[model samples]
Target: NEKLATAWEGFTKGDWQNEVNVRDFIQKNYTPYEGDESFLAGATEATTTLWDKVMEGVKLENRTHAPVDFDTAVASTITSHDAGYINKQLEKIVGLQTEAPLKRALIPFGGIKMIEGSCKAYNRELDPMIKKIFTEYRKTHNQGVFDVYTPDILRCRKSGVLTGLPDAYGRGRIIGDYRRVALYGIDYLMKDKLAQFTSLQADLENGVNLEQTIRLREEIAEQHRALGQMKEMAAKYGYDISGPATNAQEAIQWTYFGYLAAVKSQNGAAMSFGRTSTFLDVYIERDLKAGKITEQEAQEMVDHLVMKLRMVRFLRTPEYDELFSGDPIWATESIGGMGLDGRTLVTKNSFRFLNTLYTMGPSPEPNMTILWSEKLPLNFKKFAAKVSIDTSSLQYENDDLMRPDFNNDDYAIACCVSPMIVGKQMQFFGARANLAKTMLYAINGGVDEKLKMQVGPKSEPIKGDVLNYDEVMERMDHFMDWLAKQYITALNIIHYMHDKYSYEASLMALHDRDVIRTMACGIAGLSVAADSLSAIKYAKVKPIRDEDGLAIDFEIEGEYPQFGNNDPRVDDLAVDLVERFMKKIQKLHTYRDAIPTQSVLTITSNVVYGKKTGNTPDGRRAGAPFGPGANPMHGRDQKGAVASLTSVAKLPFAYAKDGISYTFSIVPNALGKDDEVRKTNLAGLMDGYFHHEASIEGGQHLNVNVMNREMLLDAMENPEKYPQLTIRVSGYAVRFNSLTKEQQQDVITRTFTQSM
Candidate 1:
């Protein structure tokens, strides 16, 4: 019942102690860092050699490291494997997903087939007994989803109208408040979880068999068990995490232990480490003032923690890799934003986080994200810009845009652009709907042009040869209504199955008993859908229909204004489309009565969507890759990146509550001639895009990449020459050499500004 020795001695007391209030602890205790990065230290000698050993492992595996079933006989858990080490003696903070470094864990809770497929892809075999247990005896999340999928859902998935659904895999984007383990420890957290379980049990006195109440009861018990397992896992490394951490090193280790537990238990797609720098900064500053640690030791602590996040891995089928290229775990760590009190939250740890890309070489993991606000310290902004230019390993989200909605300064970006109030909220992460494909279905009267089969509610095909804007709009509205309901139905079944079968108890355990659940639906091919409508409206588009009455192709007879020129013509189309879809989705009854949200995000699935889609009225040929995530169509944005950003900025965030994604690329020379000028110009570019006076609501997220087109080509030809070339591709960053050949070409062909 008492505070751990010295844990709260020098700290200010607040409501955080009486309740699980991490934000209160942060707001009351965290010192605002307003200065530049001058006080930051490079990686220590131990960190240097420690990372050298890691890179050696990465290289030894030919950069395409194989995955291993840590324990094929059982499902993965917190203590499934011993504490792994890369140079154990030199490591400061330690834990790994597997028993050995560079070996990914093959989790079987999602499905046995995906696990077996991953093992087979690497020329290994899954244990026959493990296969029998999952196939015959135990049900998986993937199997449960298929068992309930309706015929319409099946057809939509098969026709590529709905792509990249999380039905077959872990629906990631839930970030546990891992920092709780450091601030409150396992004992205190378990006490709260038990209280919640006891209270829920009280509801059973009425003999109420409500689905949600029973589900929460079981999940809370699972979470409590997981917290105990975390202590056991920490004990394997000779650490006692039963109480709050007493110093900086233990703080980082304890926080990391909680995250490590989540990864070991569930292979969620985006296992983000929540906003922790400022929370941990309180401890680091205390130790520094007490002369208990030097800057060198603090930097080493962060380096080792990030090194562990870098190595978090999950086994994937080759098919999975094709959709999410470069084998990313999306261990996203958000840094730098303004507090609600108008104080900047740019602590030294924020700079240290960016420094990892430099110290350990550019890596895709620990996916560095900066929560950018115009009012944030200018020096920190310049440093973040410099990091983006130098390493191409950072993504920026508008703190100003999201802060007003979330009203909490501590929210972190999940996976890529979706931000949730750290532990207080979670999303049922539904994948993107191919609106480009949806448009064709609308024109063809609910028929899929590629498959020549009906995929939506049957409607009459357009009678005329030339497309009429009003007629097409009417049909689009009808099919969008159908798609919205179908998509919601599919997600309802998915989250239900995921919770019923493979729930993320460890992650949920760190949250409040009562939390907000959002159905994070998404849309891909925004620009293509918008442009196709633009062609139909302004230009005369003649449909080339097949015998089955499917509009196989189209011919445009005149010029039309495309999106990304800042033109209201087609920009309004993109805007109206999202607004309409979100309205329809919000009308449906969600799985857990979740607040519905949508995202214009496509994380490397654009290519796959294009492969399954047929020709469009926008003059885009069949099988041509759509632009990634809210960007203008490739080679069509002649007005350049700024104008393109303005068009995307027009999409209302109120409609797309999950997030909107925009990846911007520019050649090094286009930014500026010198490094200082480049940093300045880069920061200015982002500041303008995020807060332009012309737009009422500015852009939400930007993934900046500064590189030459030639460099990507060189890496494609000679992969060994540039092993650690990092680049931002949709919402996350990845090593250039790790992408597939087709994915590599997609990045190459995307628009890179030659000049502003």
Candidate 2:
């Protein structure tokens, strides 16, 4: 008790002392900076040298085998590998995913086939023994979901109506409150979890064996074991982390070790790094005042922390890489928001987090995101905008829009744009359904245009050779009802098996006992669906039928207002669709009683969704890529860029609470001729887009990229020259060279605004 008190000597007393509440601790003690970047220091020699060594490793490793699957028989765990390093003597922050840098561990709990395929793709072989054990002795989460799938779900899967299911892989988007590990330590966390486990066990003896009680009790035991393993993992590196961190360096290291434990044990799809910069700033400032550390040393610690974040690697098959292009782990770190007490959360560390992009040349992992609010300090907003222009790597979300709903000032984004209060909430990641394909089903009486199968419930097709608006909408309503039930039903089965077979015990050990669980469902092809409805409503659309009486193609004989033109005629169609789908999903019963939420965001799966969907009445040909996220179709927005943004800002956040993503790309010259003018105009554009009254809460998210078309054209041909060329796609940042040729072409084809 004395040592613990000394460790927290200067901090203000709060309820967080006896409970796990990092937000309260922060609220009581954190110092929010209002100054500019003039006081920030440059990268130290140690940082520059270490970064060069890492870059060399990256280049050489890419040329070589890129070997994956170190051991097949042994599943990945916190202590699965011995201590690893990148220049152990020179590095300040250290740890690698595998025993060697960039080598991925073989995690077989999600599915044995993904491991086998990934191994073969990388020219490595998985042992037959491990495969037999997974296939025969242990049923994987993939097999369990498939075993319980209904016929309608199977048909929808084959017909490509429902896509991007997590049944075949780890359902990611769970962010553990790693700060608790730094503040409270492993011993304290284990003691509290043990107490809860004992109480639940006593309830079991008292005849309370509800699945919730039994599962949580068993999970606490697993969490206990994982914490013990985490201590073992850190001990291998000569660091004892069983107690609360006493200094700044120990604080950073201990926090990372908690995150490291999660990544080591489970290969979730999007393992996000929770909001930690401001929290760590509290410790850094304490050390500074006591003369225990210098400004340069503090910056070095942050630089090293970012280097570790950039090096987070995961094993993936060629197919998985295509679905989520650029091999992103979505290690998203949110910075800069307003506290509920009206103070800016912009600490010096927030600038340090952005400075990593310049210190180490820009890369995609550890997705740098800024929670933008007009109330934020002018100096910090300009600094964030400058970094975004220098490297097209930063994504922004509206704090003004999300803060009221989250109620707390401590929420961080998961995956791309989904917000959850850190440690207080978790989500079941349901991939998405192709709304364009569903619209085609409504037009063709529930038959898939691409697969020619009965994918949805059989109903009468929209009557008349030239579709009537009321009749088509009535058919759409009928099919949407069936689609919603099946979608939720499928999610329930997948999540049930996911918890039983591959539960996220280590990640969940960081949460409160009563966590708010959200079923994060999503939709793709918003533009295509909305435009199709508009064409049928305002223009004459003739559906050409095949021998099977299915609508093969659409012939339009007049013009109609398209989305992204600030035209309410077609924009309202998209808005209504979002609200309708969200309501339909919420009516179903979810597993674990998770709240149903929906996203209008697609990472890189828009291309794949378009390939599966049929031709639409909006003049889009079959097999063409859909616009990314909630963006309008590439050349359809006749008005200027701000007008397009206005249409997207109208998407109601109350319905699509998961997120609504908008990717906006503009040429450098479009903003201004000079850098200073460009920076000011870009910041102004973001402010106008996010705070516009088109939607009362404003646009939820924006991925801004300021680049010319020729730069991408040249990068495509000479990838070696622009190795670190990064761009903001739908919702995440990715290295240009890592994208597939088709994806690269898609980026080139998307509309880049020539004028503001």
Candidate 3:
């Protein structure tokens, strides 16, 4: 509390100017890189040392010869889980191999890889973590994290899967299933009926009908009745968990449950957890008025929450390593906005949470995201505006335009880009695409040359396949289908593994006991699936088909229109492509039991992959990167920001109920430093989006880069002068100079919106 209050007071009083002093102190002590071949030579030597250590670790493990399970044999040797583990193990081996004198020299490369590896591993483990954390929270609290449930069936429908099918198809059946199941009371009469129907259906489908099928059905019904009794028994034994309700207080309780669960499961010794919301105001004010806890205590709780957030893992810590690396757990509190009643809603607690973040300055851990809604009170915007100037401590989101489209009933901040509804009900399927990987495919004539395999849309083979755009798209669709299948295979395997190993650690014990019984696990993925599919899908059509003997053109001009430009036909086409791709991916009936019906896909924006490609059916170019994730391709906007917002508003958001993020960079000039201009711009954009009636499933996101092109160009030319130059990239802020030349150009090429 003392630390929080102190930090808050400092923030309110604008004491962060002293950060300059701190930086100077560190800089004086820290030596800038002294370019020397010896250093490079040493790095090379250290790499060899690390390689040797890795070999040693491999040798220490037994290499057993055994028959492989055909069912489990994957086409790719690297499982996402295995990849994560290997990365972590490699990091440890490298760290161990290097001496202290050389450690600093290797830290940049090693540290980044380690962090990246941990994130990969962490993503693979997120579902299990969600379950474990929520279970632990339910030990005391009434509600679990989110009201999660599995659909009873596993067939492709307009809304994707709608049921509680088992993990693997052919292993179970999905019949008489409800569209949605509550996380609580998951072990009801329905599960038994479904199982029975499944077996009976299998018998009937296999031609064993009449007597055998009827008998199986009867047995299944009996089994369901027995399972109902078991559920009762389990409830009596304190295994059945439920939650109070969805409100500020309940949300906090659930968040606490998640924290304790993570700590216990991961054995994080020094870590703690906390939450902030409009509801906290009621608690804090009531406590203060009652004199039960002082303002200091309330402040302290806020501080503790912030501290705890930093410890939240972006990646898993290696075994036997320190859990809390003095990094702040990037915790954030959300506030303001209108409720369903259309009444303005901003609580005192929202102010308090902002105050707390403002005071803390910036720590790598516990970074903050402040959501600015259209209906937000002036004071909140004022606070955010002030905080925005302090790049080290805070980040802001334009909620007015971004929040309405997300699927969740209530959205809270999670990860870097947008808010997430935490708990069992909110399933987040993860997805990501390595730009480098895509580049590799492009460079190798649409084949992963290194793997001697093909993924993604196939273009003309470098030597023989002189295909036109239509032919190319036909092959691309085939590739997309194939890619979807592979994705499903990988996802299902990981989901099954996590489900089997759900409670390997102690995290499950930390959630609210009542909520645990009902908590449903979530699954989510991130990548450029939508735009890539859109590009391919658009290319398959007639008018845009490439003509014979036409010189390939790689420019945004004459290309198929990108998303977010008020082009209903193109946007609708993109949405259809996404729907088709998702349906194809969901066809992997295997591992249905473990994953349930929930799956999420994220759309990244800001790159012009289509623009660089030469005359794609979507009229994209050869060298352009696909649009970044979900957002439109860079520089494709002819109608400016509003049109882009309108186009994005038309996506099949409801289908993306699991998880979705719509991210685009905003020119700071759009919301000028002038208070009036900022307010007007914020209000206008917000009103326009809401009026468009965006979907709730796939949420909206807006990131702003405050500097102009000249500033960025100057920074590019003279990197040292703007060492801390930060730009919003999708969900997080990254240092300008740290980005590659290509990335820098992407940023520069983005359409700069200005007031007409």
TM-score of every model?
0.97, 0.97, 0.52
C-alpha lDDT of all candidate models, in order: 0.86, 0.85, 0.37
Expressed as tens digits, the lDDT of each residue in 306-400 for candidate 2 is 88988887787776776788778889999988898899998999988898888787888789889988888888888888888889889999987
Candidate 2 residue spans exceeding 4 A from truth: 60-73, 692-695
Question: What tens-digit string does per-residue lDDT give for candidate 1 at 1-756?
Answer: 556646878889889988999999988888888788788788788888888877776665435545433345556778878878887899889998778886777577788998887777787768898898788888999999999999999999889898678976788888999999999999999999999999987676666767668888989999899889999999999999999988889889999999999998888878899888888998899999999999978888999999999888887777787778777888988898988889988887888888888778788888888998889888998999999999888999988888777788989988999999999998889979898887888888888887777788888888688999998888888888888989999999999899888888889989999878999989999899999999999999999987776789898899998988899999999999989899999999988898889999988778889889889989899999888888888878778667887888898888998989888898999888999999999999889878833347888999999999999888888888877788998889888877877888889998987777
User: Number of the top candidate by lDDT?
Assistant: 1
- Judging by lDDT, tell me the better candidate of 1 and 3: 1
Q: Return whichever of 1 and 2 wins on lDDT.
A: 1
lDDT of 2 at 271: 92
Question: Counting only residues 3 or more apart in sequence or on different chains, how many pairs clash (N, Cα, C under 3 Å) in candidate 3?
Answer: 93
Residue 658 miss distance in model 3 (angstroms):
3.6
